[PDB]
Enzyme design. Structure first.
Site, PDB file in Angstrom:
ATOM      1  N   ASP A  35       0.745  -1.269   0.000  1.00 14.24           N
ATOM      2  CA  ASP A  35       0.000   0.000   0.000  1.00 14.24           C
ATOM      3  C   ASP A  35       0.762   1.298   0.000  1.00 14.24           C
ATOM      4  O   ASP A  35       1.356   1.571   1.066  1.00 14.24           O
ATOM      5  CB  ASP A  35      -0.855  -0.192   1.269  1.00 14.24           C
ATOM      6  CG  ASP A  35      -1.864   0.897   1.522  1.00 14.24           C
ATOM      7  OD1 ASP A  35      -2.283   1.076   2.681  1.00 14.24           O
ATOM      8  OD2 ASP A  35      -2.215   1.517   0.496  1.00 14.24           O
ATOM      9  N   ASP A 218      -2.044   6.070  -4.645  1.00 20.33           N
ATOM     10  CA  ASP A 218      -2.305   4.996  -3.667  1.00 20.33           C
ATOM     11  C   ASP A 218      -2.522   3.623  -4.289  1.00 20.33           C
ATOM     12  O   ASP A 218      -3.586   3.349  -4.845  1.00 20.33           O
ATOM     13  CB  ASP A 218      -3.459   5.416  -2.741  1.00 20.33           C
ATOM     14  CG  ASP A 218      -3.582   4.470  -1.552  1.00 20.33           C
ATOM     15  OD1 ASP A 218      -2.869   3.452  -1.425  1.00 20.33           O
ATOM     16  OD2 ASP A 218      -4.467   4.760  -0.705  1.00 20.33           O
TER      17      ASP A 218
END
EC number: 3.4.23.21
Lengths: 325, 5
Positions: A35, A218
């Site tokens: 992530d 992201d």
């Protein structure tokens, strides 16, 4: 695979990408979601009381390199999920790169969505200014300081389920078979602990649906989530209808649509027509873009599965190029 | 869809 190379698995219709990480001695393989929107490495452990039985659980007792820690941690993500537990220390093997004595966070409790997903925990790749516990060095911090990587970078390739899925992360290198043309350097604003950029504008055909806006890159967010006004402006260009929940209903036949093009630092980056549709459930298609009540966008997988990114933590900066496909 | 902070 070469040194620091991590083959990813595409879950569902490009919902998420996860790779195998070996933690402990002798060591177990864990499936973590990589992530760039967080900086805490957490995993399902045998101390967990609401964890999935399908999850692989880190067992302190079977790691001869486990070192106990007095601190606790708790986290809460943007989609409302969470987890909490205790800190610890052990060795982490990231594509053949053995990070000695990394702070790993062992879950005691996790949200149900975590419990039911394909992941054993998450690998945070944002800056260390957002670690939930102060003084914790992220994996990328340890690779650099331990000299496991010579360049403070990671190359990211996210594939498309429609083309067979897959993906690949390369720590301290990149792969040019995965992109086309030249890379474009884009400066990063990491003042909020994220990989922030400025998009000069967005166009659909000849219309300027948006002017400059800031967004965070992201890898851990499925869609392209845009501020309310930008979002609405894009939707009008495609005739998408608002579901009232941050999502839109778009036509399933994208063959007629034009790509959503982003002008970032002088070059053109797009969201190809196929990508405008996230999922189709019982004949209704949910668009690849959504909306949030934020002033910045969240440049998620809808965008990343279309453009190759070289994340440089040192400058910091990123180099982007269109996927070779 | 996921939405990792």
């Amino acid at each position: 695979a070469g040194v620091g190379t991590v083959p990813m698995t595409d879950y569902g219709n490009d919902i998420e990408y996860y790779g195998q990480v070996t933690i402990g001695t002798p060591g177990k393989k864990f499936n973590l979601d990589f992530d760039t929107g967080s900086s805490d490495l957490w995993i399902a452990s045998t101390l967990c009381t609401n964890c999935g039985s399908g999850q692989t659980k880190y067992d302190p007792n079977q790691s001869s390199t486990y070192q106990a820690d007095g601190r606790t941690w708790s986290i809460s993500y943007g989609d409302g999920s969470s987890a909490s537990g205790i800190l610890a220390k052990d060795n982490v093997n990231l594509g053949g790169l053995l990070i000695k004595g990394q702070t790993i966070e062992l879950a005691k409790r996790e949200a149900a969505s975590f419990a039911s997903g394909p992941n054993d925990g998450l690998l945070g790749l944002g800056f260390d200014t957002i670690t939930t516990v102060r003084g914790v060095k992220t994996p990328m911090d340890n690779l650099i300081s331990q000299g496991l990587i010579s360049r403070p970078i990671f190359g990211v390739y996210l594939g498309k389920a429609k083309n067979g899925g897959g993906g690949e992360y390369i720590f301290g290198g990149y792969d040019s078979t995965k992109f086309k043309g030249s890379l474009t350097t884009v400066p990063i604003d990491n003042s909020r602990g994220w990989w922030g950029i400025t998009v000069d504008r967005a166009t659909v055909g000849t219309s300027t649906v948006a002017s400059s806006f800031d967004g965070i890159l992201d890898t851990g967010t499925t869609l392209l989530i845009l501020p309310n006004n930008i979002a609405a402006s894009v939707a009008r260009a495609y005739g998408a209808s608002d579901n009232g929940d941050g999502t839109y209903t778009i036509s399933c036949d994208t063959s007629a649509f034009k790509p959503l093009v982003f002008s970032i630092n002088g070059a053109s980056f797009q969201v190809s027509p196929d990508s405008l549709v996230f999922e189709e459930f019982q004949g209704q298609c949910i668009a690849g873009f959504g909306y949030g009540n934020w002033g910045f966008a969240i440049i998620g997988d809808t965008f990343l599965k279309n453009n190759y990114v070289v994340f440089n933590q040192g400058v910091p900066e990123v180099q982007i190029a269109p996927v070779a496909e | 869809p996921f939405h990792x902070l």
